[PDB]
Amino acid sequence: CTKIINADSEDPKYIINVKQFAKFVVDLSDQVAPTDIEEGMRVGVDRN
Amino acid sequence: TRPANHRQLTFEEIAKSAKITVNEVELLVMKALSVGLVKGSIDEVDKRVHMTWVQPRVLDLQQIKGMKDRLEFWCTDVKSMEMLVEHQAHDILT
Amino acid sequence: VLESTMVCVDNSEYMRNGDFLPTRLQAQQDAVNIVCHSKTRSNPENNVGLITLANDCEVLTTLTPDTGRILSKLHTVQPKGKITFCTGIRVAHLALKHRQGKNHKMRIIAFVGSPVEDNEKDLVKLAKRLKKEKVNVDIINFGEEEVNTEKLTAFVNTLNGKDGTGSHLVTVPPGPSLADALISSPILAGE
Amino acid sequence: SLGLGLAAMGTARQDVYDLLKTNLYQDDAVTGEAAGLALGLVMLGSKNAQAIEDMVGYAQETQHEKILRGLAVGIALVMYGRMEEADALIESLCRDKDPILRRSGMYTVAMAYCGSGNNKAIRRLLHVAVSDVNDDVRRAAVESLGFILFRTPEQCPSVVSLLSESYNPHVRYGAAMALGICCAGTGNKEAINLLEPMTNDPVNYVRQGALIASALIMIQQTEITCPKVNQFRQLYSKVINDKHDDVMAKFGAILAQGILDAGGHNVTISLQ
Amino acid sequence: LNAKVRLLREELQLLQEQGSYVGEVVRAMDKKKVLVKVHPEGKFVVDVDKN
Amino acid sequence: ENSEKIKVNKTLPYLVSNVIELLDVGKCAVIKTSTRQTYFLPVIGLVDAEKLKP
Amino acid sequence: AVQKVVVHPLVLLSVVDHFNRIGKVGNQKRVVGVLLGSWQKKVLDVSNSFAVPFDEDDKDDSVWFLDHDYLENMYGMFKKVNARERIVGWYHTGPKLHKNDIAINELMKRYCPNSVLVIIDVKPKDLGLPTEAYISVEEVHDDGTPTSKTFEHVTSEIGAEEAEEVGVEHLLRDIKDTTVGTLSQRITNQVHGLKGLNSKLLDIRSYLEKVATGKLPINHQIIYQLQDVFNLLPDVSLQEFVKAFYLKTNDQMVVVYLASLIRSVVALHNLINNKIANRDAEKKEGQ
Amino acid sequence: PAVDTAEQVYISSLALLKMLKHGRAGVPMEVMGLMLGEFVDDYTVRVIDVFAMPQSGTGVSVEAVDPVFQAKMLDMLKQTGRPEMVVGWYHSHPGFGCWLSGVDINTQQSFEALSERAVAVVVDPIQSVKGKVVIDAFRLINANMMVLGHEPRQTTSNLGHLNKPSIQALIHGLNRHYYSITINYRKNELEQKMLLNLHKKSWMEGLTLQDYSEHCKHNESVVKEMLELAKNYNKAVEEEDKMTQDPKRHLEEHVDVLMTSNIVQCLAAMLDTVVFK
Amino acid sequence: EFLHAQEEVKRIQSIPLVIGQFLEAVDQNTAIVGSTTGSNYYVRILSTIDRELLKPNASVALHKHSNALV
Amino acid sequence: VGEVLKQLTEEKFIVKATNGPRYVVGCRRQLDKSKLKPGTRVALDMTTLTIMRYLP
Amino acid sequence: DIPKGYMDLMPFINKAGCECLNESDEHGFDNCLRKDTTFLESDCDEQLLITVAFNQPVKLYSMKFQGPDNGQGPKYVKIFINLPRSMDFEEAERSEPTQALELTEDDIKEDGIVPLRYVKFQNVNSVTIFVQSNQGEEETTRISYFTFIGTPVQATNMNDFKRVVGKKGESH
Ligand SMILES: [Zn+2]
């Protein structure tokens, strides 16, 4: 994560960089505590 | 009125029609072509006018009957050639 | 009652008359407003349409339950041409035929504020057809009474046959706006 | 209904016909196939106008392809042994637009001109086998050809050799089966010669047809009377015992063993 | 005619089959398995066929 | 309901991209997708064309 | 105005399906629907359609109930499905026009000012396209004849996107005609051309006979076009055309003759090759 | 019970055209729709019409059915003359084969739970190059079917083994989680004529001559190429006869083209000279 | 039907092809190519694509699927 | 987004997309011709890869 | 009466769609659906047009459309199926029926069951029955009972579409 997009209060709308591939804007799924992302915390990501 | 077979109009024919001596039939056909009414050409060495076109106009019932008769003859010709070809090529029509 | 009604509006140029204040146009406007809201106040699922009997009939709103759109498309009706009662009533019949819920009884509430330049024989024939096809016509007769109230009376009597209370004919003599009579009339009194 | 059709085969018993008609006058594919076959068998060789009308009407009026197939075989059986009294029905069927009914027409040609070598019927079938759009009808055309030519078995290799080398696998399979029906219980050497290459055909159902046709031709034969019988027994065994070979080819090989050893080596398939 | 028609048909049928990648075998480990690197992506092990 | 439709079609795995170049034919875009690519667009889309500067 | 209307195979099949699915359950003669498509210059491209409930009295000829609420809702759904397609007129599967047609066009003009009525004839004829397209025009006639709201022809064609060619080709592969000129096919094409020319000339003659005997009024546009056709008839007895025709016929037949000679030589060469092959086979069999 | 290996999904002409159009009307996104049809008995699934579904971002999944849309359009179709069922769902795979992947199995499980005969049709509109339509119909295999010691689908007719499967589908399990039902398109006699109208050539095209300049250029070019082939043919025949084909075959095709062109144009010319005077 | 087959071949020689460098001639009817995508494939070249001019290191269009040099 | 390269037969053009790959592609009929010459930025169709309309 | 496997199609009739044109208000449509001797009367002419609607498509094997035996009974029964719009007594006189029954007193009697052409009725959602003539000739026609015997076609009742497996987020 490189920019938490200000979190827009609700609906944080995280962002991520998969490096050589691309730069995506992403949500949280099944994650219990949607704060433990720390804006650089090397988060998880799905394929499609 | 004249069909395409002999649509060659002679200067003497024009003169015997609308009354002008044959030294300004050239100008009459000139103005006719210029106004856009009749297309074609003038071949005055042999004193003839090849009209290849005419400004279509509104006709009468008699003239439409004339056209109907000509269509009848044309249809007879077409059907004759149609039958000839279909009868002589019966074995190679898929 | 589960019934589908087809409000027919006469938008003929005779609607310009001001003998029903403010003008017959707004008199019909108010009448349609009241009748549509009353049909809604009945069991709501019932439906109301809209037809205009202009020079040749036209259909404004096919059967829909929300009266808002009927009223909105009624507001723009303007006076043009003359009336065609037979064509209007048959087109209304077609509109009823294409009704989603076939239970809804067939009713046609027609405002007939114009001389009906039709023939009595044709009117009685059409009445016979509607009687066989189960259509109940409620005519609001306001205008050229003496010219056509005879034909309308024959029409509605034929519809009623011998005991056919379904079809009604309410003649409104010139007076106040064309609602006060309707709010208390046999067509609307039961509703 | 299949059993009752078999039992009353030939007999035109009106009671059985009515029961089978009542069963067919429902719509289940499974019941309809058997009902159609049973109707045909019960009315076999009777040209009953009522039966033909009922069957063709129901065939055009149903929506189940299986019932249509059963009715096709049934209509064909109805015009059994009636050489030229079928021409009307044959023309109607062969001109119809439902491919199952066109197949009905070809089976009708076969069962009408059964074993009469009628060149009219052979010309009809051979024309369709090349000018039809449904391979299911082309195959039926070739098989019917087989039925037509069985009082003159020598001739069938002639008509079928040209078909057997065709690019249409269905026509190939029909050629194999026509050879079988024609030269059934005759061990015709030319027939076996034509079938032998087809056993190595890249299409499984043509392989199956070749195996079954060989079985029908060689039924009840010894080595002396036919030289390739052991060759084909070994070929059936190899096809069955292979692991790469296709399921339907294995089916053909199994049925071929059964046919070849039919009836404890004591039965022959003689159409006459 | 049949021969030429059939040849064209088989040509179409076999030519409608998807191609195959070309890589270089780093080392043939075990029978029927080969470690082969296929350009430009990384290197995979294979399931060598029977032919 | 149209807003609801736009919301439903605005799922949120968007790809971050640039707007490298702009053009008028209406407004268009020549965006450069971070997945290194250059994609042209006739209808700029949900962006209100707030001058959409390169 | 619009000059050309290119209809699509999907539209045609949809109309056929509508007609069948209503005729099976009843007997309505006409079936009526809306056409969806896009413009490109003055070339309408009809690429979809959908049925709209219709019902009319075939006696009165002015009582009908095309359902505009259904039209609007259905168009909303197809707008959601695909948006580059707006209502571009209507269609009805009746072999000929009807009195209602102008009123129905007035209704549909609410949703498209440029309405194109395509009378898709389900019945398969063997000479013409199944689509004939019309557009409503009211204008003061130049000849001073009283003016009324009547239809005018718009040229029609059938064309297809590649996504539909892939389908039509597959569906018709069984009864397809080779997309190459086999001499038999070309002679067939010319015979069919003569068929069509005869049919059209018969139509023109029938119309002219009706006009002359008076059962129909005179249409100045039609008379104009016919006399222009006669104007365009060519002459063949003219000498410097017979000369040219003979010249090019002779050139073409020199090419034909050379072709025939080459074919003869090749045939003889093949015969020799086969005779030699058979001779070798016979000699080897003998030895 | 079992599903016979003769079952066929008769896809009508209209359905096929709609499917292909919707596929190439949304490639390289995926598209989905329903297949209104009729379960005839046990061997037939008639797909009479198809039914686009609005693109809804979530690819093609259960949430992509939009109940309000489907219900309202089914009612409207009912009153316009389509009182038909919903026999399965089609969904395009833009260019990456004709099989299923995970979400497809989940969605098809939903459809089967609704009614356990619904097919799922997959169309690859990019690989559907003209002359080959890549459409395959599928249905699932019960978890207690291939594990309980039973084959997925019985076989009573030789019909179900006339079409071979594709390795593309095999890899993803064309026989581990789902079937492959045959298609067998159903064409009336009227649809075929209406489609023939697509390329039907007009009588004008039948009776119209070829530009004489271009025709003469074509004659000249073909005759020259044929001269070259004739020189090569002389060389080849001499060489082969001395020491004991491409020239002959090329010469034959070129003679064919020349003669067909010349005869056709010449006959058209005579026909016109007689018909138009 | 032969005419239909020939037309199907002429069709396989499609328009939307993708360009790439034909590398070598592996065998009869088959060869190895390297697309402009940067990856190399092994395919079967259509009949009579001028195997005279299909020299190694050649510029050649390929069928998008099957990568067949056509 | 890509550039024509060589202008094959007037129904075909070699176009190099941005990411590098080069395809022989069609030419949209209304697009007209003679405006696409080597180096002409074009908006290739995403799937059929047809030159839909040029660009500056 | 009821061959095994076929059941009377009462439970699948929804009153939301049933109707009967040209019926005397004294005797309603509810009369024909009780098995009691409660009848339905014709209003104006010797004709009647009933219409019944089913929730799910059904297959009709036989019909029990019977009346009294006093000369006031149906004679010519034209059966159409799956009508998009309610029809009229003018289309009912020319439209080609899906069935064209001509009842006789035997069928009319309480023990009469008329079997239809099963095949043409393999998917029925709405049935319109036009009684065109009375057994003899009576200005008023009367119907005593009417019910269909058949089987229901398995229904794919949409709006039941739900996630039977998986999460709620998979797209593709
Ligand atoms: Zn999928």
PDB file of C-alpha atoms in Angstrom, chain F:
ATOM      1  CA  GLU F   1     -31.893   4.036 -10.236  1.00  0.00           C
ATOM      2  CA  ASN F   2     -29.371   5.211 -12.836  1.00  0.00           C
ATOM      3  CA  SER F   3     -27.089   6.264  -9.980  1.00  0.00           C
ATOM      4  CA  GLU F   4     -27.503   2.797  -8.481  1.00  0.00           C
ATOM      5  CA  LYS F   5     -26.595   1.270 -11.848  1.00  0.00           C
ATOM      6  CA  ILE F   6     -23.443   3.392 -12.073  1.00  0.00           C
ATOM      7  CA  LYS F   7     -22.579   2.405  -8.505  1.00  0.00           C
ATOM      8  CA  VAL F   8     -23.027  -1.294  -9.290  1.00  0.00           C
ATOM      9  CA  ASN F   9     -20.828  -0.939 -12.369  1.00  0.00           C
ATOM     10  CA  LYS F  10     -18.215   0.955 -10.314  1.00  0.00           C
ATOM     11  CA  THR F  11     -16.702  -2.048  -8.601  1.00  0.00           C
ATOM     12  CA  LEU F  12     -13.417  -1.192  -6.940  1.00  0.00           C
ATOM     13  CA  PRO F  13     -10.573  -3.156  -8.491  1.00  0.00           C
ATOM     14  CA  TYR F  14      -9.689  -0.131 -10.641  1.00  0.00           C
ATOM     15  CA  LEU F  15      -6.299   0.002 -12.323  1.00  0.00           C
ATOM     16  CA  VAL F  16      -4.293   3.132 -11.610  1.00  0.00           C
ATOM     17  CA  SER F  17      -3.546   4.925 -14.863  1.00  0.00           C
ATOM     18  CA  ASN F  18      -2.334   8.267 -16.149  1.00  0.00           C
ATOM     19  CA  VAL F  19      -4.074  10.656 -18.554  1.00  0.00           C
ATOM     20  CA  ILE F  20      -0.941  11.227 -20.610  1.00  0.00           C
ATOM     21  CA  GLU F  21      -2.705  12.938 -23.516  1.00  0.00           C
ATOM     22  CA  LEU F  22      -6.099  14.435 -24.320  1.00  0.00           C
ATOM     23  CA  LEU F  23      -7.893  15.205 -27.564  1.00  0.00           C
ATOM     24  CA  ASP F  24     -11.135  16.515 -29.044  1.00  0.00           C
ATOM     25  CA  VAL F  25     -12.851  14.843 -31.998  1.00  0.00           C
ATOM     26  CA  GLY F  26     -16.205  15.226 -28.146  1.00  0.00           C
ATOM     27  CA  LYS F  27     -13.572  14.782 -25.460  1.00  0.00           C
ATOM     28  CA  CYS F  28     -11.343  11.703 -25.543  1.00  0.00           C
ATOM     29  CA  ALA F  29      -8.409  10.309 -23.584  1.00  0.00           C
ATOM     30  CA  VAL F  30      -5.117   8.582 -24.394  1.00  0.00           C
ATOM     31  CA  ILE F  31      -4.622   7.190 -20.902  1.00  0.00           C
ATOM     32  CA  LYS F  32      -1.446   5.309 -19.944  1.00  0.00           C
ATOM     33  CA  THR F  33      -2.225   2.303 -17.770  1.00  0.00           C
ATOM     34  CA  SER F  34       0.331   1.547 -15.068  1.00  0.00           C
ATOM     35  CA  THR F  35       0.312  -1.958 -16.403  1.00  0.00           C
ATOM     36  CA  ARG F  36       2.603  -0.451 -18.935  1.00  0.00           C
ATOM     37  CA  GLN F  37       0.198   0.274 -21.762  1.00  0.00           C
ATOM     38  CA  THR F  38      -1.388   3.128 -23.706  1.00  0.00           C
ATOM     39  CA  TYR F  39      -5.165   2.867 -24.143  1.00  0.00           C
ATOM     40  CA  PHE F  40      -7.224   5.311 -26.200  1.00  0.00           C
ATOM     41  CA  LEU F  41     -10.781   6.157 -25.182  1.00  0.00           C
ATOM     42  CA  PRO F  42     -13.583   7.849 -27.183  1.00  0.00           C
ATOM     43  CA  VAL F  43     -15.967   8.506 -24.289  1.00  0.00           C
ATOM     44  CA  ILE F  44     -13.834   9.722 -21.398  1.00  0.00           C
ATOM     45  CA  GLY F  45     -16.365   8.087 -19.109  1.00  0.00           C
ATOM     46  CA  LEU F  46     -17.558   8.916 -15.619  1.00  0.00           C
ATOM     47  CA  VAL F  47     -14.947  11.672 -15.254  1.00  0.00           C
ATOM     48  CA  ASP F  48     -16.703  15.023 -15.578  1.00  0.00           C
ATOM     49  CA  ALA F  49     -13.853  16.423 -17.714  1.00  0.00           C
ATOM     50  CA  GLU F  50     -12.665  18.841 -15.049  1.00  0.00           C
ATOM     51  CA  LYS F  51     -10.148  20.038 -17.662  1.00  0.00           C
ATOM     52  CA  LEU F  52      -8.610  16.560 -17.282  1.00  0.00           C
ATOM     53  CA  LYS F  53      -5.127  17.980 -17.666  1.00  0.00           C
ATOM     54  CA  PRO F  54      -2.424  15.770 -19.207  1.00  0.00           C
TER      55      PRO F  54
END
